Subunit: 240 residues, 4 copies
């Protein structure tokens, strides 16, 4: 059994990754995963959980807000007490507050950092500890092309994504000594609830969640000897 | 049908990519590729061609030394006259001359640059022109982690690989305006004839060519709307 | 008068930058600055102020904590109300909490981010608004080599410095449209109170604050047509 | 006495660097530079030589085309025989051939690479050997923002500049072990003969060669303990 924890599994990219893992197992006999799915909305988890079980995958739903250190503790405790082992952590949960530099607020800043940087760091800190002892494990970070490129209305978002890359790079130093794989997925525009509105013509200039999920699962299925360290995906026409 | 040209298909990564495309078409009914395989050794081409045909793929071998502008012309003409269309170019052909800074010769320099930079540039120039007119196409560049990181015995190799990245980045500017996808594959140590001899470590500390071929083919199979711009792969233990 | 605000002016690099600007005003008469010096320690500001005055420069000290939004507002209004404009902002104030991944605390995280990212962002937001209106101005960000490279005990520090680079890059987008210069200073090890300890040996393998201050002042003195966008400095023997 | 060799000293940036070094000696009584000036045009060398001697600097002119290996040999021989020591090498000589991807020729390629990569590599190889033995020395590489960013009509130029960066990064690995400093100067548009034409408005959005020379000389004058590894400069309005 492969124990996988996917955060932000209720919508968009996280949801797509969960389904792709479920489908991959349905066609990859030797691969039997337990999909531990988490997000802030129980209702979303119930729906994706059902969809994954429909594919024949085992699931475990846990409602948690990683911006709340208490929930980070609960997530960790859940893995430790119920499985005592973790094979894959997909740090997908993330938020974005966009706007002109002058319009961004302290609330926009705190909201963005509490999830993108704080929750992501402490969940990683706690679960990497298990992988370190196992001398095995794979951590995926869904950052963004915004982790290496700036955009006008993304001052705070870019600080948070460049920041996540900083954590990713530090984790590589720890991981190479413990047989742990670190993958940094950097996508450009993906049509998901994160965008809200989105006109018809705009949707045609975006990638779809499943486009990101495929490479993520393939990376996990690579033999342990190899790590897809980075995967950058964008709409063929470039950034919006 | 899809017209694909893979340079350096005789061995190593190029051979692995050719074979993976063949296997893909075998389990992905709707993808019928014509694998145009090129190398400097006709003998290698015949062997890999047979293997691909065993998977049920159509092949077309042609001997060509991309360091020879005459052969670059012959290769381009072949695609234009025999197919008059190209869907995928895999710029895999490449050489490596390594050694301490003080020991590298003018010959090491010319040999490396004539293939990695000159041949690669002119073949790309000619075939991209076709894709630009088609408003469709995918070009893969097998560069290296040495395209963004230096290694003591790779002064000339790094000059050529950083150089290839310069070409890749310029091609993105052109490609995004004509529906063409550009993929930069950057692998670390891969056990291939390029290394020569190995032992306990080396091999055990390296990736295998098929590990690189898998994501290359998956990137090509992505819907036209999405481009996997970069894929960085390394042995889980890091550079050695 | 050239109105300069230097945060973290009481110690290390900030202190050296303040002194170097004062010395430049003595050697380059055409340059008349008002050095607004700020930090969290009053006595520090009094001493550096006296030293800068000894060089014949004008100074204005203000004790403030940039992690306190009220003080950020106080610093900004002081500039507007007393001088009406700002010509240079040196975002030097910064903190560092280091340790093995497993030893870092929530307090280490909050303390680092509140100053390095939050205070820096909001002070930049406020003062850039002024420069944008003036269509003139220069903002220096003292980030670090840790903004592009990771170090084992710098997981949180790197998240914060990579994060600052994210802000820097976004600011360039805004700055180019209103004649404002953005400079990102990235130093390696510099002997300052931030390191505490000592050892004549390791101290000999570090740069000195004045080595960083020189290029900063030279960059400000460049004609308005030119911006030194980035300056990377390291001990000749590399990172320690 | 400091022995400094500056290639491409007859025009633009190289010429400005030579003059700035000569002028800097005025504020440093213990700095007596011997400026070895080289380029392909003897007439230009005589001119800059006179201007430098007028500033009180010792000069030595040598006509050499670094794209001709024979000249690289004679240039190297000159340094070894006349001085037997070299304190600074400024690899400034460089050429540019621009145009749409489809219009670039094999000659554009060879001309660019023979100077930017080949001549630069072998001159660096030969002189670094002297510095390694001395356990002292400083090498400046004038690359470009085009060494990290692509431009539409710069496919070949970018291959050569990204390529130069590859050499720079490899040199850092060797330099850190023998007390040698490596500086990578990356400028954006600079009004020099390289551009030829002008239009006042155009020239108004460019930097001037003296703007580049200033930081170069100051980097050399830093104490030996510190190396300014990179300096990126651009017009305040950005790339044209
Ligand atoms: N969409 C793009 O264009 C794009 C591009 C590049 C990178 N990314 C990144 O990809 C990741 C997913 O983006 P998306 O487009 O899929 O966003 P989305 O459609 O809004 O879905 C986000 C998911 O993350 C969960 N989540 C957010 N904050 C959380 C928290 N504090 N605790 C627990 N769960 C949390 C959300 O839960 P709730 O809905 O229940 O609150 C939801 O399940 C993010 O890191 C995003 O930055 C997205
Ligand atoms: N192997 C690694 O660890 C590694 C890591 C990073 C990047 N790469 C890159 O991956 C690519 C393939 O490497 P590899 O390890 O597979 O090398 P390899 O095992 O030596 O195979 C190289 C292939 O390229 C062909 N080739 C070379 N120069 C050519 C030319 N001028 N014209 C036509 N064909 C030419 C060779 O043909 P002949 O044998 O008939 O001459 C052969 O078919 C290269 O760009 C290499 O730099 C390799
Ligand atoms: N030192 C290095 O090796 C090195 C290398 C690369 C980058 N850097 C960066 O360079 C900058 C300065 O470092 P340093 O070594 O000079 O540090 P330092 O010697 O400890 O001095 C830091 C200065 O910043 C002030 N400061 C810190 N947080 C502040 C806040 N929230 N509000 C107001 N003032 C604050 C401190 O004031 P108080 O002392 O009164 O509290 C002090 O005046 C930092 O951004 C640091 O990250 C340092
Ligand atoms: N100008 C810009 O906007 C800009 C921006 C970024 C980087 N750069 C780089 O800065 C460096 C200087 O550029 P520049 O604008 O000063 O060029 P420039 O005004 O055209 O002057 C070039 C100098 O280099 C010499 N040179 C060129 N090729 C040579 C060779 N093969 N052998 C010996 N000497 C040679 C030229 O000598 P002859 O005239 O006698 O042939 C001349 O002295 C180059 O590496 C260039 O790529 C320039
Ligand atoms: C790279 C960046 O475009 C990408 O991370 C991203 C994700 N979600 C987004 N969501 C909105 N609403 N706006 C954006 O610009 C945006 N952008």
């Amino acid at each position: 059994k492969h124990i996988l924890l996917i955060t932000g599994a209720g919508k968009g990219i996280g949801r797509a990754i969960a389904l792709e893992f479920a489908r991959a197992a349905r066609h990859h006999p030797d691969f039997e995963p337990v999909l531990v799915l988490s997000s802030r909305t129980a209702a979303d988890l119930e729906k994706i959980s059902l969809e994954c079980r429909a594919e024949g995958a085992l699931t475990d739903t846990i409602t948690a807000d990683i911006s709340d250190m208490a929930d980070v503790r609960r997530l960790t405790t859940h893995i430790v007490e119920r499985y005592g082992h973790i094979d894959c952590l997909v740090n997908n949960a993330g938020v974005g507050r966009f706007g002109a530099l002058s319009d961004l607020t302290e609330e926009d800043f705190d909201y963005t950092m509490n999830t993108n940087l704080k929750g992501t760091f402490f969940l990683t800190q706690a679960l990497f500890a298990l992988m370190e002892r196992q001398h095995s494990g794979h951590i995926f970070f869904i950052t963004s092309v915004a982790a290496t490129k700036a955009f006008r209305h993304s001052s705070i978002y870019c600080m948070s994504k460049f920041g996540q890359r900083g954590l990713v790079e530090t984790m590589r130093l720890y991981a190479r000594k413990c047989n742990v794989r670190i993958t940094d997925v950097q996508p450009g525009a993906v049509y998901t609830p994160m965008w809200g509105k989105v006109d018809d013509e705009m949707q045609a200039l975006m990638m779809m969640p499943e486009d990101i999920a495929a490479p993520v699962v393939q990376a996990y299925l690579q033999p342990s000897r190899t790590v897809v360290e980075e995967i950058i995906l964008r709409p063929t026409s470039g950034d919006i």
